[PDB]
């Protein structure tokens, strides 16, 4: 159910080499909160990869601590997938967390590295969140 304490979800960004603005994935519910993958180019240069939580809510009383593994899937060999871990207390003023320079843009778009295919790159997040506060009273 949506109350699950953890989950793994993916989002495939199409026309990746042409990405010019931030893109958001549909939500994956964990602890009954919407979590989304946010990807954005940073300075071509680097791939920005962030995990967002409950950004749509107008509430300013919620908080949720979570740990996650952000990974860019290598379609040729999963062992070559690149990942970084995060731990963060999400709340209205800090509702997303990740890396502005997760990977070099040149590396992810290199047709010989195995991260891109048909100009598509897949991002994956494994999130483990604690019970949130200020949500379900």
């Amino acid at each position: 159910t949506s109350w699950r304490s953890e989950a793994t979800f993916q989002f495939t960004v199409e026309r990746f080499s042409r990405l010019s603005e931030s893109v958001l994935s549909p939500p994956c519910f964990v602890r009954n909160l919407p979590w989304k993958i946010m990807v954005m180019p940073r300075f071509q240069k680097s791939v920005g990869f962030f995990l967002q939580c409950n950004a749509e809510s107008d509430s300013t009383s919620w908080s949720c601590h979570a740990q996650a593994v952000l990974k860019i899937i290598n379609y040729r060999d999963d062992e070559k997938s690149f990942s970084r871990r995060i731990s963060h207390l999400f709340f209205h003023k800090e509702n997303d967390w990740g890396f502005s320079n997760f990977m070099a843009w040149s590396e992810v778009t290199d047709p010989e590295k195995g991260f891109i295919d048909d100009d598509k790159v897949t991002f994956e997040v494994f999130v483990q969140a604690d019970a949130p506060h200020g949500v379900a009273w």
Partner: peptide, 4 residues
Amino acid sequence: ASTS
């Protein structure tokens, strides 16, 4: 790590 940081916010976007």
